[PDB]
């Protein structure tokens, strides 16, 4: 589904951000 | 109606048309002399007056403003040219 | 493909309408999209109207009726067979059945 794929994307952006702030 | 005459329209259809959509625009309104039964002076009032006109001397009220043609009171004449 | 000109609802020149609940499943359905049906039935059906009339204390007492305005969602109105799917040309018929 295009909405749950959008939800999986936002759950992935939130992980890439926290992984990027750890090494900031 | 492919050959309808636009330059010479019948007067029954020009009065039917809107006052702007006619061949030459003309108002649907007019003036009129109101003679109240109490006095003798006639007053030239507009058909679509929209104001509360009064006779000379404050004898009575001639017409009342409405959404269209003004509503005259009892015993009055109109339709002047 | 646009299956219906009115999009399945009687909303024209209007932004939002208050919703209602289908009688089968209490789901939010717009008031115009709802498949309404005003049913007027007697409290006593024909199978029992004979015994109730002969056991009445009044000489001439007419049995009352149940004025219930039923609302249906599109899904439940079709499972309950109150509206059927019609042919592509028969759908344009807006007259109630006789």
């Amino acid at each position: 589904r295009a909405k749950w794929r959008k939800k999986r994307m936002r759950r992935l952006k939130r992980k890439r951000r926290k992984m990027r702030q750890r090494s900031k | 109606p492919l050959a309808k005459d636009l330059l010479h329209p019948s007067p029954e259809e020009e009065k039917r048309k809107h006052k702007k959509k006619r061949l030459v625009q003309s108002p649907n309104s007019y003036f009129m002399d109101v003679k109240c039964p109490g006095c003798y002076k006639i007053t030239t009032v507009f058909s679509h007056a929209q104001t509360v006109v009064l006779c000379v001397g404050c004898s009575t009220v001639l017409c009342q403003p409405t959404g269209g043609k003004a509503r005259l009171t009892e015993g009055c004449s109109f339709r002047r040219k | 493909t646009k299956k219906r000109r009115n999009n399945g609802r009687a909303k024209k020149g209007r932004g939002h309408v208050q919703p209602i609940r289908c009688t089968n499943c209490a789901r939010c359905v717009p008031k115009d999209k709802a498949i309404k049906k005003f049913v007027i039935r007697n409290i006593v059906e024909a199978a029992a109207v004979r015994d109730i009339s002969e056991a009445s204390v009044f000489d001439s007492y007419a049995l009352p009726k149940l004025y219930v305005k039923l609302h249906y969602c599109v899904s439940c109105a079709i499972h309950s067979k109150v509206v059927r799917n019609r042919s592509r040309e028969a759908r344009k018929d807006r007259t109630p059945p006789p």
Partner: protein
């Protein structure tokens, strides 16, 4: 808003010819329209038109002869020269045997043939054929 009056004038004529009308009423009139209808009338594409004075922009009732295929405007009014006049004849006119491109030159409003005979360019108003 009506930013071009010659456009709505020729559009009403073109639509009235497609409907088989005998007369068409051009509601807004102007000097450019009357001189445009004259160029079409001198070549026999429209009949006699009667200007109606109403102390305003004015109206025109054009008599349609049925000989007009299409009349249209060219907006904006580009600057047309003599060396560039043959280019517009191939894009707008349906043939090299008929059809005219109306130009507003300093010598007045005329078609492309009269503009070439007078040897003067100008601005393009529209076309008819």
């Amino acid at each position: 808003v009506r930013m071009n009056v010659l456009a709505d004038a020729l559009k009403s004529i073109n639509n009235a010819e497609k409907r088989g009308k005998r007369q068409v009423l051009i509601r807004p009139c102007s000097k450019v329209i009357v001189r445009f209808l004259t160029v079409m009338m001198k070549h026999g594409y429209i009949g006699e038109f009667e200007i109606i004075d109403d102390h305003r922009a004015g109206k025109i009732v054009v008599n349609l002869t049925g000989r007009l295929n299409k009349c249209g405007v060219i907006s904006p009014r580009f600057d047309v020269q003599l060396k560039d006049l043959e280019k517009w004849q191939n894009n707008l006119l349906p043939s090299r045997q008929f059809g005219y491109i109306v130009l507003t030159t300093s010598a007045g409003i005329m078609d492309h043939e009269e503009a070439r005979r007078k040897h003067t360019g100008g601005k393009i108003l529209g076309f008819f054929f």
